[PDB]
Design a protein around this ligand. Sequence first.
Ligand code: MG
Ligand code: MG
Ligand code: MG
Ligand code: MG
Ligand code: MG
Ligand code: MG
Ligand code: MG
Ligand code: MG
Ligand code: MG
Ligand code: MG
Ligand code: MG
Ligand code: MG
Ligand code: MG
Ligand code: MG
Ligand code: MG
Ligand code: MG
Ligand code: MG
Ligand code: MG
Ligand code: MG
Ligand code: MG
Ligand code: MG
Ligand code: MG
Ligand code: MG
Ligand code: MG
Ligand code: MG
Ligand code: MG
Ligand code: MG
Ligand code: MG
Ligand code: MG
Ligand code: MG
Ligand code: MG
Ligand code: MG
Ligand code: MG
Ligand code: MG
Ligand code: MG
Ligand code: MG
Ligand code: MG
Ligand code: MG
Ligand code: MG
Ligand code: MG
Ligand code: MG
Ligand code: MG
Ligand code: MG
Ligand code: MG
Ligand code: MG
Ligand code: MG
Lengths: 156, 77, 50, 102, 50
Amino acid sequence: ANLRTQKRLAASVVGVGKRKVWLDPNETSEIAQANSRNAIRKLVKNGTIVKKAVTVHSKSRTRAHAQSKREGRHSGYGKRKGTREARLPSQVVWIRRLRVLRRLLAKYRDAGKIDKHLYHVLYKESKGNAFKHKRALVEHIIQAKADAQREKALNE
Amino acid sequence: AREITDIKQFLELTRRADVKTATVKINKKLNKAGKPFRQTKFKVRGSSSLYTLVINDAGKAKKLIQSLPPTLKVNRL
Amino acid sequence: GIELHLPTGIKVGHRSLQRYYKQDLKPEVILTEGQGTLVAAETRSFLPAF
Amino acid sequence: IAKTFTVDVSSPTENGVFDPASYAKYLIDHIKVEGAVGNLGNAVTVTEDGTVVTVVSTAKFSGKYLKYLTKKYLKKNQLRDWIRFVSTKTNEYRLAFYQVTP
Amino acid sequence: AAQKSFRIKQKMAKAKKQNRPLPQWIRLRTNNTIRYNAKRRNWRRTKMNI
RNA sequence: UUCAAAUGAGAACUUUGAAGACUGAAGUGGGGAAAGGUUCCACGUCAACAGCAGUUGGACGUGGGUUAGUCGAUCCUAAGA
RNA sequence: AUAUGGAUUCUUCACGGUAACGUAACUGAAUGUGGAGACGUCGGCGCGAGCCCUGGGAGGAGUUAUCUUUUCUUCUUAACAGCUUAUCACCCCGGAAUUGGUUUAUCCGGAGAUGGGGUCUUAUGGCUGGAAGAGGCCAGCACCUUUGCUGGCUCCGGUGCGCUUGUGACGGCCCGUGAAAAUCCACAGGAAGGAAUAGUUUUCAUGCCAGGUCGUACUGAUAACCGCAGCAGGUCUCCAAGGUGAACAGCCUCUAGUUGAUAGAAUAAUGUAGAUAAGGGAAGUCGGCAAAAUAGAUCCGUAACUUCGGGAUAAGGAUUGGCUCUAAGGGUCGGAAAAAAAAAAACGAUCAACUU
Ligand SMILES: [Mg+2]
Ligand SMILES: [Mg+2]
Ligand SMILES: [Mg+2]
Ligand SMILES: [Mg+2]
Ligand SMILES: [Mg+2]
Ligand SMILES: [Mg+2]
Ligand SMILES: [Mg+2]
Ligand SMILES: [Mg+2]
Ligand SMILES: [Mg+2]
Ligand SMILES: [Mg+2]
Ligand SMILES: [Mg+2]
Ligand SMILES: [Mg+2]
Ligand SMILES: [Mg+2]
Ligand SMILES: [Mg+2]
Ligand SMILES: [Mg+2]
Ligand SMILES: [Mg+2]
Ligand SMILES: [Mg+2]
Ligand SMILES: [Mg+2]
Ligand SMILES: [Mg+2]
Ligand SMILES: [Mg+2]
Ligand SMILES: [Mg+2]
Ligand SMILES: [Mg+2]
Ligand SMILES: [Mg+2]
Ligand SMILES: [Mg+2]
Ligand SMILES: [Mg+2]
Ligand SMILES: [Mg+2]
Ligand SMILES: [Mg+2]
Ligand SMILES: [Mg+2]
Ligand SMILES: [Mg+2]
Ligand SMILES: [Mg+2]
Ligand SMILES: [Mg+2]
Ligand SMILES: [Mg+2]
Ligand SMILES: [Mg+2]
Ligand SMILES: [Mg+2]
Ligand SMILES: [Mg+2]
Ligand SMILES: [Mg+2]
Ligand SMILES: [Mg+2]
Ligand SMILES: [Mg+2]
Ligand SMILES: [Mg+2]
Ligand SMILES: [Mg+2]
Ligand SMILES: [Mg+2]
Ligand SMILES: [Mg+2]
Ligand SMILES: [Mg+2]
Ligand SMILES: [Mg+2]
Ligand SMILES: [Mg+2]
Ligand SMILES: [Mg+2]
């Protein structure tokens, strides 16, 4: 009983690797009759030939580790390898910050929250790194509005 | 290949002299309100292309199956 | 551990054998009287061609 | 928005291996609604006539969940290997035997 | 090669028929000196050089 | 690497099941180019060959197999002849 | 090859739109002109595809003394076709200094910006057809050289400095500016050609026929090729999962694939490869040869010299796990008879990343 043929077939027919195929060891006489891709298909549906289950790879350990990770778990120096830059490029950090600063400055000019002349300055004042983050901008804005209102109330 | 829209225009196609066969397919789908209904596609094989009319309304569907030329071969499902 | 004998007089199976269950197998070879007759009548014994 | 799941306990019960009351007692206590157990707020009700068990749920719940609790309670009582949770139609479920021989 | 000018593939054919064993009725022809085919060639040992 | 079974005159080495392992996607995976030329695949087989063995084989014997208006060549020019 | 329908014409070779252009069409020889074919390399950015991750749901498998709304897995959609969809670009209105718009990257504007309203390329995506009838996942029936049959379910989302890759508009580089031809199209041109009882037309729709020759198996290498061989050598290329980590590094696994390199019994010398050593610390040797020490990241600190750019990671210090916290960093939307057999009837909300 040499089954190397029928095992090569079943693999192609059941549409899976040779290593996942299973031939019933007690039907050995039976399977030896197969010899044809058609024959085999009886044997698959019949149940005497079977597809083994994919061996299990669970991600559960990593899920758990990434879950804790996003609680800010192991960021400690000892857990770092690449440089600060290699982790999170400065250029990306910059680009993110400006975009936010500009979409802000945009939305304001179009809500009439600021005039054009004032805008044009904070665009230049922004590109030149005068604002750490989005709140710091709106602060200087609030200070510039209350600024031209102490020049207006004393010009009244 | 081509979906036909007009039903007065589809009915000319049904003759056209080059169309030997056609078919009526029945599907079970559900509308945007998530309710089960019956859709019907009229498939007609032209020489060089396939025309299919879609009717979601069941009534104008069932009656249009009587609107077919009797000479023309029809496969139900 | 193989089978379980229930109060209704019912033997229930084990899940470990699950594919010996779903596996159908060959039926008995059942000879017709025509064939049955002939087989018990046959004295020619063929191993050899050499 | 409430969905209705129903399990058929009939075949193992009348052959003597199963308790629809015990099984239903369990479901109530082990079902987690938006948190820990017992918390069913009249958002979930396990009711049983004895040939069928019925979960009616407004709260987050599924076939999977129900199969995971029922396949779990099976193990408690060692009726795993003698019985299997199986779906006849969507949300209409059945507890059955693998090989029944006379 | 797998993409071959016809002239090449035409050649390979000839080779395939020049390798088969001597026809076993020939050994019994009167005054025959030929024991077996000496011009046999095995794809592994001797290349044809086209 | 290990255990059982089948096969067989004969099993450390063949086939199946079980188990343990490794390549770890820049692979021991899936395809191709040049080159080879039937090695492909089945049946039968074990004299020589596979620096042990052999029931196995890219070995030996008998056969079967390669399907195009669209994938290539064919057409065009390059350095050149 | 050709026929029917459409379209054009008594204003013969169509009409609309201010325009960019539009459309189911709408004659066009000689000759001419223009386009495509047709193009480096690198950098970042935007968009897409596939993959990766991930929530809800419908199934099947696994584990369950104890815990886990749990772990694994199926839930897919081609060429081709219609309708729609873009950055760039261009058009009309209008007329800007209180200089404005704008990219990550500072370029743009009276040779007409911003703003208002449009036009196009269809790269790419979207909905529908193709097409669920296919494929996949489950529960079933019968049949053993018939072979199939029957049921269900194939659904709805999210996220990104992610990975490969396509592409776009950009920027950088050069005493280097990174093929050619077949082939097809448009245009200028007006030869020629033709209506009113009729004719033009095949760049519109539909219909009819034909598509020759040769290649096509398999290997592509720790056995199919070259090395005299089944030789640790040599030999161009595509696709590429999870974790750790800066990483296509190393180490572990998943899909697929192998488990083939003569075996058994003992464990002496000398070996080959790999290791460790008290005290000393190059006293060894032609010679610190060989080996050891150092190493990642973060924070501090960093000389002489110098072509002012370097030297420089100079030298030299300190920190690094686990756990619980704190703070900071965003998007979207709202202000003939008898018997027997057999057959049939300045807020608010909400959503979400990690990185310090
Ligand atoms: Mg920290
Ligand atoms: Mg990085
Ligand atoms: Mg920088
Ligand atoms: Mg020669
Ligand atoms: Mg061995
Ligand atoms: Mg490994
Ligand atoms: Mg191949
Ligand atoms: Mg072979
Ligand atoms: Mg053989
Ligand atoms: Mg030998
Ligand atoms: Mg021998
Ligand atoms: Mg041979
Ligand atoms: Mg044809
Ligand atoms: Mg071609
Ligand atoms: Mg050109
Ligand atoms: Mg399309
Ligand atoms: Mg669709
Ligand atoms: Mg589609
Ligand atoms: Mg189907
Ligand atoms: Mg889908
Ligand atoms: Mg991306
Ligand atoms: Mg590449
Ligand atoms: Mg091939
Ligand atoms: Mg390969
Ligand atoms: Mg080699
Ligand atoms: Mg060779
Ligand atoms: Mg040679
Ligand atoms: Mg790669
Ligand atoms: Mg990885
Ligand atoms: Mg990482
Ligand atoms: Mg890696
Ligand atoms: Mg290794
Ligand atoms: Mg292989
Ligand atoms: Mg082996
Ligand atoms: Mg060796
Ligand atoms: Mg001894
Ligand atoms: Mg020492
Ligand atoms: Mg010491
Ligand atoms: Mg010392
Ligand atoms: Mg000395
Ligand atoms: Mg000395
Ligand atoms: Mg020396
Ligand atoms: Mg050294
Ligand atoms: Mg120095
Ligand atoms: Mg230092
Ligand atoms: Mg600490």
